Paper text:
We hypothesized that the addition of a 50 kDa Fab, with its distinctive elongated two-domain shape, would facilitate accurate orientation of the proteins, even when most of their structure is embedded in the membrane. Among the cohort of sABs, we identified sAB24 that was virtually universal—it bound under every manifestation of the BRIL incorporation. We affinity matured this sAB and obtained several variants with subnanomolar binding affinity to BRIL.
The cation-selective nicotinic acetylcholine receptor (nAChR) is a prototypical member of neurotransmitter-gated ion channels of the Cys-loop receptor family. The human α4β2 subtype is a heteropentamer and the α4, β2 subunits can assemble heterogeneously (2:3 or 3:2), which have nearly identical secondary structures. For cryoEM sample preparation, the expression was repeated for this selected construct in the presence of the partial agonist varenicline, purified to homogeneity as a complex with BAK5 and vitrified for data collection. We determined the cryoEM structures of the sAB bound receptor at a global resolution of 3.7 Å and 3.9 Å.
Numbering used by the authors:
A (entry chain B), B (entry chain C), C (entry chain E): 2 to 326, 333 to 365
D (entry chain D), E (entry chain A): 5 to 332, 563 to 596
The structure:
Amino acid sequence: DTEERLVEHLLDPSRYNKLIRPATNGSELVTVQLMVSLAQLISVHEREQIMTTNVWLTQEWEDYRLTWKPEEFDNMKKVRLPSKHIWLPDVVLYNNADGMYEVSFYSNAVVSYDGSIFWLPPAIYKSACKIEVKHFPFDQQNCTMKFRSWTYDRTEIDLVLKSEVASLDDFTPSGEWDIVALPGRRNENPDDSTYVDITYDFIIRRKPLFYTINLIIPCVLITSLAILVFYLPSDCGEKMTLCISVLLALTVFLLLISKIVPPTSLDVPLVGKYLMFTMVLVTFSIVTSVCVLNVHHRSPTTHTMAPWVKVVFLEKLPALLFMQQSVSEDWKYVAMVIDRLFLWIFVFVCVFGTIGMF
Amino acid sequence: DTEERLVEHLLDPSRYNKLIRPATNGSELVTVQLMVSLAQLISVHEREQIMTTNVWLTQEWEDYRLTWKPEEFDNMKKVRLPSKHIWLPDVVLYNNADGMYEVSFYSNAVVSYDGSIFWLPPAIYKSACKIEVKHFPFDQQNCTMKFRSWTYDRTEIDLVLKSEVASLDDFTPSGEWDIVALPGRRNENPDDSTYVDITYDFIIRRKPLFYTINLIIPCVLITSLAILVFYLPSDCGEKMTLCISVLLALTVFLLLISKIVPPTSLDVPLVGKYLMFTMVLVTFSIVTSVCVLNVHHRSPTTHTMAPWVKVVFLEKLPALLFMQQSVSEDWKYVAMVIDRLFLWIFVFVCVFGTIGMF
Amino acid sequence: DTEERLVEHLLDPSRYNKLIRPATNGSELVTVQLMVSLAQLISVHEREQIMTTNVWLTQEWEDYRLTWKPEEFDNMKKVRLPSKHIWLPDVVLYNNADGMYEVSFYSNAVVSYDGSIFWLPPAIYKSACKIEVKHFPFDQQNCTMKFRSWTYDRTEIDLVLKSEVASLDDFTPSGEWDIVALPGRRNENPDDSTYVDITYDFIIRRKPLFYTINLIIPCVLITSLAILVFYLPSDCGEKMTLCISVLLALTVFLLLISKIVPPTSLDVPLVGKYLMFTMVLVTFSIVTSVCVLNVHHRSPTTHTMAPWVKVVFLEKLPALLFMQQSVSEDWKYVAMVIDRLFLWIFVFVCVFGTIGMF
Amino acid sequence: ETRAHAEERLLKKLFSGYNKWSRPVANISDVVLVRFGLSIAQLIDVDEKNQMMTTNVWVKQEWHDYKLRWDPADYENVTSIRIPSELIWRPDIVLYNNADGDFAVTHLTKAHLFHDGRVQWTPPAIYKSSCSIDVTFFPFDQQNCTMKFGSWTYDKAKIDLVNMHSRVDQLDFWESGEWVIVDAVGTYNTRKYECCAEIYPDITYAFVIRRLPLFYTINLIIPCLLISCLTVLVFYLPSECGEKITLCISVLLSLTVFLLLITEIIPSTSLVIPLIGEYLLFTMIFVTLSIVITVFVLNVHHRSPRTHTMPTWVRRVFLDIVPRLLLMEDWKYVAMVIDRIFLWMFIIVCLLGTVGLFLPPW
Amino acid sequence: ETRAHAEERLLKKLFSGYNKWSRPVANISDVVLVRFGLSIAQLIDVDEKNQMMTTNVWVKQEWHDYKLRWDPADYENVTSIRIPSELIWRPDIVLYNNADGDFAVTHLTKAHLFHDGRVQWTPPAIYKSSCSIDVTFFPFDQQNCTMKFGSWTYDKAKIDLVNMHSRVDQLDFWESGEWVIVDAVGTYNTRKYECCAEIYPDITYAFVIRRLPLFYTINLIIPCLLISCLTVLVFYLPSECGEKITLCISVLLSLTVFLLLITEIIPSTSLVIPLIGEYLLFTMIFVTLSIVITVFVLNVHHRSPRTHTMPTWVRRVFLDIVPRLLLMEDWKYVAMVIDRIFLWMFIIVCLLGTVGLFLPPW
Ligand SMILES: c1cnc2cc3c(cc2n1)[C@@H]1CNC[C@H]3C1
Ligand SMILES: c1cnc2cc3c(cc2n1)[C@@H]1CNC[C@H]3C1
């Protein structure tokens, strides 16, 4: 029964006002020791540059008008209170999307007899961290979280850390994303001198297997067919089909990968780069291949193929280590020669690019 | 402790009423000096013509019934107050989608002893700016933001600017979109004389690289194959495949680009225009190519190809600088001639259009 | 002016309390006669199993402490009141998605001098009705709507119907969906004896024309080409193209139809069934057709086609009523024979399935 | 002395014995006149697929009460004051045609008392109405969307609406870009409902609006019209090549895609059908018939005298047909012939259909 | 006299000196016993791609306080009354496993006092939990989703939960259609956290549920299984036609699409991998290898003795291979031979892989 009397004595509207803050001896600052405790990293939406987490941030401070005599009140060293009626320092994100800053539940608050207070409510937070996307999927993202009041300043409160690292004891594995470090730093401005903030910097690494399987393997597997249409004979009447199909599949994969990543024109990933390059390559291939096909399907009556071709190509034969040769047959052989030359330089350039990636 | 007495003396319900506005000496206007401070430009949704920003608009004004004697109240020159209980002039957008006008947090309000007041709450605003889309993606958009009360008029308040430019001290870079200028202008109506507004005109430029890579390069790369099917021989039996594939890819890109941009029938972008033109070109190509193919696959028994063809075409040969020619062979050569002529005029028209763009 | 006095006499906080219910002579039940009146059937979202309607549910009951003497109050037999201050029995759905139960507007309430009360507010309701999807689109859906309080039980109120049918006087036609019957039944539980509910069972029929045109016609039109590739000659080199295209279009239509309907594995519609069957058919066709093509391309040097083929096939000829037959020519004729046989059995099976649907 | 002090004294005298829920009339048989009007601000969206219409609209009401009156010479010459709409009488004005909305204003802007009991109220609102969409002449369409305002619990002998301006004001209209408002009229009406015996009034605002057709004309119909020229052409393509059915199949699948894609932009109403879907359907029909006939042809051409036979009467028939066609043992000549004769008929049919379909409208 | 009059008098006597925020116990050492339970109403959605679970659930709590007691014979024999849950004590019951939710009931249904201090509360709720999704035997999958209720600011020496029924009631369950609840158990547990020294209890409800596999079996796997028969077949297709790589490319692209489409329905967890993606991947590998080998073939066949040469040893080798194959300068015959010998190996390999992959499970 005493609890009732004690409470209804503490929160008396006449004795205790909430709209003000506890101060004495010359407007001394009230310290606010806060530390965050993660629970799980729900999601990281790249396309929108957002991160959804669940968090319990423990605040602690001191109030000089919430004290009592324990022996009077049947030796009570501790009580619960509602966190709407007592004072409390406003503390939220600043980089928040959804325009939702404050916490959700507004839990109870512990109170001792020395006046201390220890309050931790839960929260789901939608932070906005910028995605550095160059080594996709093997990337190390870096998501920031601010904390500072938005009613008071440094000349009325002073925030402090308790542990330089964000606790992780109640954390549940996330699957995709895996943490590395959770540093937390206090920050202050000398030019302003009224800007105190706490910044926690989650460092995350992605597990690559999923996107590897679903994107990379098909990608490389398909682009491995661009250096091959040259080894196909022009009598089949099929080079166009293969080349076209490859180009279209390639464009599709490109659009898709550009969908999965955000539209930040600041940096470009590696995969889209490689894909654009090999696309340019394969279109050069299609045009040179149509030229080859035309020269192959020429007849004697229509063209004479006067000197230059004869000597130039029937003498270029050995430089390739390609060998040893009715006019239509000579046409066909010229075509064979030129296509093999192009095949050589194309495989060379493919290896060159694969090196360029390292 | 004094703070309590001072506050509970100022906001006394009898001495102070909120539903009215401060006036004396003949219903004099109360000035309202407001200036906006951006924080970031969250998004620009073209398809819906919307812009999402985060903003802190600082208002300042004067009230003659919120003054006190500092020396009496322990030399207090400044206090905080809640912004629901005191007066405040209503100020919002007018072009707002979501039907949400007022601000979100309703922060505290500073108060000095001269009666001045300085109040800045935060906000996320969804403005509606019309998209001028002709030079896509190299476009300079122009998004407007209104500000005016919707309870009072000019004969009871008068809004004013403090700085002609919107502050950008806290602007965090946006990635895609890059600002150029943030002018702000006061506007008044002589015919009405009861219409005061403040209009801030953000001028934005898009960074082109992303959409460039993902749309333009494939788009030009593919359309570069429309002037080529003519150089393909009709014995391969493949012109139809290539032409059809090009046309279909083209239609796809067209539908897509029309999705990405809003459905404003007022203006048309350049890319869709070029694409429609080259589509018309390639269908003309398909029809003339089938004609060529038919004339190629004619035999002597079925047709006689009496005089006109012989002299006309075997004499047109030199005008092309194309040369030098059993009846089926003459058929095939006529086909070759006509297709080369069409190739010439088509490359000419392609260059002509590329010029037409400049 | 009297209205003021009368009201401020009835709703006096001392004389009238709202948190209790009207009772006398031994905790007698207060009857609650409710009947619903539809206005329009906004939507039926199959993919999510939801129905959105607009409804006015009229409740009526009796209260013994809201009576007066008409002649005293200037002969007033009727008044309006607000429906927050008076008592009212809680009545909502139970099968509601959105977690939104109660009504929206909370309209005024009529009051006579005998104490009766007649209250109808409006509402938009998102009910959850399970979709029986087998005769798509010619289907008769059946959407249920519950009504029961969620604070009281049968030993304190007793619900009742006024008309067994839901009124449709203010109903506006819906276009797609057309009503048939709107029965309403009271339900009670003997084992529980504290479970009173009212269930209205809307019976709906879909108008088929739209989905007919947009899905069925293309579907049947395309599948009508699966029994035809056999009548195509193997020298054209084209059977593969047609068969493949048909199979792909078929798979596309299948995925699409499975998107439009909900993912209830309880039952499977008729269209997907027919489509899967004919897909199996066409793949059997592709494999037998490649076999035919191979046997057609064979040459004399490579194979001898020793006795069995000769007699078996050149004697099977008449059983087909197919007639009358250099070795390569015999190859080609064997191919013709076998493909015609397969054509016969395939058209037979197509008719057989069309019958299987009836 | 100060205007503000007299303003307080007045405001405090008025709201001493006032009751919101009491109707403001001295004689019960007397009615109030609620002058009513609108003023658009923009037309956010018109969702055809769901048959909805979003509007941002500045409702305008004004009436007169008999208790909010005073004398101005006694209170330092104040006639107009401003008070919240949360402390006075405020009529119940609803739209019966809502769809995922709020049925009333909840912004609750202040109100202006005018010293003669007259009061004036102008709360904004975002309204989601449901208007039936008729789609036959797509995209050249004139839509007609309604909004039915009216009272809820007050008959015609207690409340009586009055339309201020017979047209909807458009002084601050914001050009949406795609839809233009031809005209917007406001009608008065009465009705009787089953609930009750008295009659209830209502007001019906009708917006007749047009669609600017450039976008769908330049992104949707031009390509479907451009790949329909290729429906009849395959016949002028020979059989030795092997690219007939390729063309035919491509065209068929493309048209099917365009139809299956436009079905996303129009509702699923079955009363009517657009004019584009029907044309595309006829085209798909004729092109699949074309693939059938051209496979028959291809089979004819590749025949051979040893394998196949029975050119018994076809000789006379086709050697008598070829002269009429003005085209002057071997099967290939007859394939050419049959191809030509079907080509003529199909060009005629496509011509005649594309024609006789679009004429009655224009 | 009237039951309602006595009911008022009682209700007015009880709430004279009551304090919500005061714990209802006479001796500080004494604890209250919060009997707890659930009752499903439906299982709205289980989002695999985001790893979430939505439930509509009728929480059930009951306890006993020492101030809400009276005598019934003095108040006309009333024992049970009903009051809002907004004026009495109401314990803090939270789920630590939320994801885009509310952490507590926001509907605040009334409460039933039972004349002996006992009080009973049953507020509904929509809860969004996050349960890890294991996907290997897709679609034949048994999922296991959790919900961890418990108190926030009350230790075990002030509050102590008690599970009413060891199973989750399903009397008003609404069959969702796709997911069925095999079983649903409720465990009690304790723990100690870093914040503090005392121990805190908790309750853990586990739902083990199954998926009805007809839909994805009918619409997703049957076609990917039906276009895998065509992976090995191209080899039985000759080289004079020109339709080998066409078939191969079509199959490859189709399988790639099906994989790139199923990646939309499963999460992006990397711990495990489904059994369908892996099979499709192996198939794509072998079919691109097939296109490589068949282009090599096509090159061999179309060779010629003048252009190309060096059939030095291949004569003996292939004329010695052809008899073992039971198949009796010829660029054509050696092409046929090599084609056949690769066909046999690839049918063997596809057989063996499709087999040895699915066996350990069954
Ligand atoms: C008393 C209280 N509410 C009513 C609501 C309505 C009616 C009569 C009422 N009478 C009908 C007429 N106006 C809206 C509906 C329907
Ligand atoms: C003060 C007030 N409430 C608390 C709630 C909790 C804790 C500490 C608290 N301290 C953690 C330990 N028990 C439940 C959670 C988590």
